[PDB]
Write a protein that binds this ligand. Structure first.
Ligand SMILES: [Ca+2]
Ligand SMILES: [Ca+2]
Ligand SMILES: [Ca+2]
Ligand SMILES: [Ca+2]
Ligand SMILES: [Ca+2]
Ligand SMILES: [Ca+2]
Ligand SMILES: [Ca+2]
Ligand SMILES: [Cl-]
Ligand SMILES: [K+]
Lengths: 98, 103, 86, 98, 83
DNA sequence: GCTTTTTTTTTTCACAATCCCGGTGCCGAGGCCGCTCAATTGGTCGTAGACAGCTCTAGCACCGCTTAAACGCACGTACGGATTC
DNA sequence: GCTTTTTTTTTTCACAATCCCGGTGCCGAGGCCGCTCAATTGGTCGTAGACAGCTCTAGCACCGCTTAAACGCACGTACGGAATCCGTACGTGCGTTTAAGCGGTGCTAGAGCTGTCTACGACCAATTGAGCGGCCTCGGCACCGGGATTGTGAAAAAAAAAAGCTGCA
């Protein structure tokens, strides 16, 4: 029974997704999450579909790029597994977070 | 006077002129510079009230840049407003990362 | 008005999808503790971006958030976005 | 023969400088740098005194701030000593250099 | 020696003092040059803009405003010189 | 149990730094002076935008089948991290 | 300097994954059309700013003292990081469950457009005190020394906890 070495598929995924541009979050789950959060601020709101798409474009990009910063932060501490503290440093140096 | 009408020290007149002139819009409502004076006045007072405390807490009568820096950096909200601002002669908040302290 | 109150949709942002985003960021190995932490971050992004869009809406008196509402809001957060007007 | 252990004056010096507000770079050398660098964009330039001090408040401010972020990276790599790769990472993450 | 690389006028002692005020304890030797590099890029960027202001205003004297306006553009807003 | 080492802990002494007294003198905050222009005013005119009414876009709900993806568990390797030096 | 294994390297096939083509089909890039409203023409009038001339501000050069800071060197402690070692968190793959997505269907809130009318804000001329710069004063605050007090640590001394050896039962 054939079995790929841990990392060899992660590395493939890494190349698969860098080559592409389609959105990586499931479009309805995300849409439900937009609407849920928006209630906090105002009820019985409609969203243009383009406004929701504009939000999932702006989100995915923000995280995808935070994950870059975060990966350097893992590697800086001679690791390969990104950990919570990695994100938190990335965000503290970005100044998103006290 | 207008500032007197609005309950304000800040000059509702002067403010109104800076808006027409200052390339913000073609026309300026009669409310805007009243409101705008009030908000500038509010924020001014919160810093001075906090920095005037920092002076007295250092037995000093005159407020200095350090007193403002201390007032401002210790107030979660004022810090965020002035997060990308530098106060000349403010200095920085005493703080030493824990893993550096002895034992 | 014909049923609209929302559930708990943050778990909709599945571990598969967070893993795919990390993949696009060139991340090879991911700790157990990332996925929940990521949702916190994502939530706080969205809360901030929608608050501001929702403001721009409430000002123009609309009950419909436009793409421009979201665009104007994103430029405000220093996250300028291209290809939805403006 | 009294001898304080490594790092124990450091901490004194930290406590000391964090308590104070006074420029830490010598003012004349700084100024001679500001004119050296100004030449490369225009010759026979004069400066207001306060222009140089505006430049020097701004510089130290940036440097101090960068050192905080540098320290944080160095502590993130389970280290106590800042090194260039700390500065360079904190600048990579600030979006200052690619 | 002692000749016309004014950047070196930025002494180790002064670089040490900054990183102190920035809560730094133990300082690698390589750092005082890295710092020197970084400081220059900082000034280059700010001064280029400040003098770009100067040349536009048709003057030979760099004002403190010119710097203030430059520092705003670089996102390093500075209070207490004419803001 | 014993003795014999490292390690850990406690106790004692040295030294900066702070705060309390005593002081002096410099320099700029503060406030008054004397002039000036920018704020105020009532008048006149034009159109911005409130409003109300009308159109019809597009946003929201609902369904049922298809199948791609998420899900959860078994399995073991290479990673993280502790320790040493 | 060996003899005996582990460690690292090599070579040989099996297998999955990705790659590249032509074929096929759908739809949106591209473009033509006809009508509109915004860019252009040609005119007028008023003032923003270019320009010359003069004022005096503050930037520069220089010099000669007095330190405080930079400097260079001796010395060693605590640090960075290399090397080892061990447990399991993570990746890979499977069978099972889920609901996203799809395309269609039916309803209407509300986005957005129109026309109407007036409340309001820009414009003006006349007046005038609020706030400007200039300048004088007087006490806050920097800096002084003496000595007590309190953090802040380093060393040296005591205690304890491991390291190694035992002397019977
Ligand atoms: Ca006294
Ligand atoms: Ca075509
Ligand atoms: Ca199963
Ligand atoms: Ca209209
Ligand atoms: Ca009206
Ligand atoms: Ca005055
Ligand atoms: Ca006084
Ligand atoms: Cl108004
Ligand atoms: K503008």
């Amino acid at each position: 029974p054939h079995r790929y070495r841990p990392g060899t598929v992660a590395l493939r995924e890494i190349r698969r997704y860098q080559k592409s541009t389609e959105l990586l979050i499931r479009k309805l789950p995300f849409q439900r999450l937009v609407r849920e959060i928006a209630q906090d601020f105002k009820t019985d709101l409609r969203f243009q579909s383009s406004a929701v798409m504009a939000l999932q474009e702006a989100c995915e990009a923000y995280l995808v790029g935070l994950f870059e910063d975060t990966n350097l932060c893992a590697i800086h501490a001679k690791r390969v597994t990104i950990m919570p503290k990695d994100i938190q440093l990335a965000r503290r140096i970005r100044g998103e977070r006290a | 006077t207008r500032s007197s009408r609005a309950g304000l020290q800040f000059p509702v007149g002067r403010v109104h002129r800076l808006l027409r002139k200052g390339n913000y819009s073609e026309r300026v409502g009669a409310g805007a510079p009243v409101y705008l004076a009030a908000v500038l006045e509010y924020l001014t007072a919160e810093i001075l009230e906090l920095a005037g405390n920092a002076a007295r807490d250092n037995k000093k009568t005159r407020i200095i840049p350090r007193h403002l820096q201390l007032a401002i950096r210790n107030d979660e909200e004022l810090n965020k407003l002035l997060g990308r601002v530098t106060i000349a002669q403010g200095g920085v908040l005493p703080n030493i990362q824990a893993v550096l302290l002895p034992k | 008005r014909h049923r609209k109150v929302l559930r708990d949709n943050i778990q909709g942002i599945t571990k598969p999808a967070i893993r795919r985003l990390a993949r696009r960021g060139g991340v090879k190995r991911i700790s157990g503790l990332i996925y929940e932490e990521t949702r916190g971050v994502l939530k706080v992004f969205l809360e901030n971006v929608i608050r501001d869009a929702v403001t721009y809406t409430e000002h123009a008196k609309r009950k419909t958030v436009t793409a421009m509402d979201v665009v104007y809001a994103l430029k405000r957060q220093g996250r300028t976005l291209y290809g939805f007007g403006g």
